Amino acid sequence: GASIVSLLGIKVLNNPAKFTDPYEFEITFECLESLKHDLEWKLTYVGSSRSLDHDQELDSILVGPVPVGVNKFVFSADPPSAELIPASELVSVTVILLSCSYDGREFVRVGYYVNNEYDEEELRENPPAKVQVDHIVRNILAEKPRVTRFNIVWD
C-alpha cells in the first residue's frame, strides 16, 4: 500500500547558529496504521571524505509506539567533535542528512547543504589550519532541502 508514514513538515530551528550549537528540527509526520516497531530518526554528518569526520551518525531517537494520525516532535543532536573538522569544510559546503528508518529500513531522507563561514574577515581571508570552531557561523541552507522517499516493507 501507500507508505505508512508520510513526512508533512520540517522546520530548521535556531539557524544560523554556532558550529557547536545542537542541530534542531521540528518534524511533523503522519502514521496511517499501528506499527510493530518504533521509528528511528537519525542525523548523519556527511563531513569530508579526506578526513576522519565523514559519515558520522550524530544521534538517533526512537519515536513510538506511534499513535495513528499526525505526530510532531523536535529532533535535536549535538554537533560532531570539533577535533576532527578539517579546514576545507569552511571552504566548501557540507551535507547533513536527517533520515527515518523502520526496523533498519530507511524510508525518508532529508538532506541539507550547510555553509560554514568564519565570523570575522581576517579569518575568512586567512583561515587558520587549526580550525577555530568557536568562530564558525553555521548556516543550514533550509530553503533547499533534498527530500528522498524510499519504498519499504513495513509489517
* Look-up of cell digits 551518525: 57
Tell the smallest beta-carbon distance from residue 31 to Br ion (Å).
Answer: 12
Return the number of the residue (52 or 150) whose C-beta is nearest Br ion.
150
Return the number of the residue (84 or 113) whose C-beta is nearest Br ion.
113
CA angle 37, 76, 62 (to 5 degrees): 10
Return the number of the residue (60 or 139) whose C-beta is nearest Br ion.
139
Tell the smallest beta-carbon distance from residue 102 to Br ion (Å).
Answer: 9
Cα gap 88→21, rounded to integer Å: 20
Tell the smallest beta-carbon distance from residue 107 to Br ion (Å).
Answer: 6
| CA count, 13 A, side-chain hemisphere, 64 | 20
Binding site for Br ion (CB under 5 A): 3, 13, 70, 90, 105, 111, 117-118, 124, 141, 143, 146, 149, 151-153
Tell the smallest beta-carbon distance from residue 84 to Br ion (Å).
Answer: 18
In whole angstroms, how large is the CA radius of gyration of the chain?
17
3-state secondary structure of 113: strand
Give the residue at shortest CB distance from Br ion.
Answer: 111
Return the number of the residue (18 or 105) whose C-beta is nearest Br ion.
105
Cβ contact 5:28 at 8 Å = no
Tell the smallest beta-carbon distance from residue 113 to Br ion (Å).
Answer: 8
- Please list the residues that pair with 78 across neighbouring strands: none
